[PDB]
Write a protein that binds this ligand. Structure first.
Ligand code: ADP
Lengths: 159, 79, 100
């Protein structure tokens, strides 16, 4: 009853199921430092709109407003987009060109160097071991950008 | 500097008679209060010092360098 | 580095929570969604109270990655850093006498 507090509509609001807070927390809630209220209110908005647009007959009637994780993901994408103007933030505008694990021999090195400092790919804490970055070198125009987005969105989280 | 080294070891072995646990007199590491006879600190040179210095101190100008600057002098201004 | 590599190889970082999902199929699991395995996994995740994950981080016991003399010998007589004293002879050659 935070949602319900002042939304004085006929029936209260709730999710009641199916959402996965780890997914919401991890997927893009990084750099949403506070004002998740924006996210949850946009979710309420989509849900309530989808509710009220129902016809009286409609073949069916919904008893109460229910938020779904798909609209919440949509809302978080929208929020990140509208925040982009405030502060620059890359997106995923890529089509039919993603997660080519077999693209080249280079991929194995990328994976075997991105893994060690992370727990889930490599249990070692890399205490004394030297962490390092990855530099690509060669003629321009033949793979230096798409690799980065691919790696970031498939194995890492933020780009 | 040789005198300083000598007096340094002198002071060290002197305070080693009072700082050690068998003496347990003073361990402040400020022993000049204990050695209040500042005159005892007087460094004075001896032929040991000058002899070793003459042994351990090459001329700081090369024969080549002195020759070169003699040549420079050979540009004897006004002639 | 070699010791931690050997420790990683020995541990092999394998055989973690095998067979977590239980077998729960039922006959009527037809006439509808054909991804019933995904839905069942979804529900098995959902029945959990919350993502506690209060596991003991000390279980790894990373301190056991100790070296051995055989591992020490993995040096394999690495190349010298200084090519040759011949390149540096003059260094002391000029300072056989006292310094300037
Ligand atoms: N082997 C490849 N790996 C990744 N992307 C490729 C590859 N070959 C072609 N491409 C496509 O063409 C582009 C290759 O060059 P790119 O990475 O854009 O370098 P530049 O930024 O210098 O143009 C990529 O953006 C991608 O769309």
């Amino acid at each position: 009853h935070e949602l319900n507090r002042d939304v004085q509509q006929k029936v209260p609001v709730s999710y009641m199921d199916n959402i996965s807070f780890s997914s919401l927390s991890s997927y893009s809630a990084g750099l949403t430092p506070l004002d998740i209220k924006s996210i949850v209110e946009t979710a309420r908005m989509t849900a309530t709109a989808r509710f009220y647009q129902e016809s009286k007959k409609c073949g069916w009637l919904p008893q109460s407003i229910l938020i779904t994780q798909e609209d919440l993901s949509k809302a978080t994408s929208k929020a990140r987009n509208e925040f982009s103007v405030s502060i620059g933030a890359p997106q995923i505008p890529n089509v039919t060109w993603d997660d080519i694990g077999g693209i080249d021999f280079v991929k194995g090195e990328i994976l075997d160097t991105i893994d060690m400092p992370l727990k889930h790919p490599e249990l070692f804490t890399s205490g004394m071991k030297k962490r390092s970055g990855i530099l690509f070198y060669g003629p321009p125009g033949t793979g230096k950008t798409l690799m980065a987005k691919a790696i970031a969105t498939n194995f890492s989280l933020n780009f | 500097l040789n005198a300083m080294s000598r007096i340094a070891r002198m002071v060290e072995k002197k305070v080693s008679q009072h700082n050690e646990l068998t003496g347990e007199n003073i361990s402040t590491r400020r022993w000049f209060d204990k050695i209040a006879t500042k005159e005892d600190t007087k460094v004075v040179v001896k032929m040991e010092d000058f002899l070793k210095a003459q042994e351990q101190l090459t001329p700081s100008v090369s024969r080549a360098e002195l020759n070169h600057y003699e040549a420079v002098r050979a540009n004897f201004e006004g002639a | 580095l070699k010791s931690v590599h050997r420790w990683l190889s020995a541990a092999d970082q394998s055989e973690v929570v095998p067979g977590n999902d239980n077998i729960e199929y039922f006959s009527i699991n037809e006439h509808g969604r054909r991804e019933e395995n995904r839905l069942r996994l979804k529900t098995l995740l959902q029945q959990d109270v919350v993502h506690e994950t209060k596991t003991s981080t000390s279980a790894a016991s990373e301190l056991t990655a100790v070296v051995t003399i055989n591992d020490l010998l993995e040096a394999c007589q690495e190349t010298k850093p200084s090519i040759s004293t011949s390149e540096l002879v003059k260094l002391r050659g000029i300072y056989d006498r006292f310094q300037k």
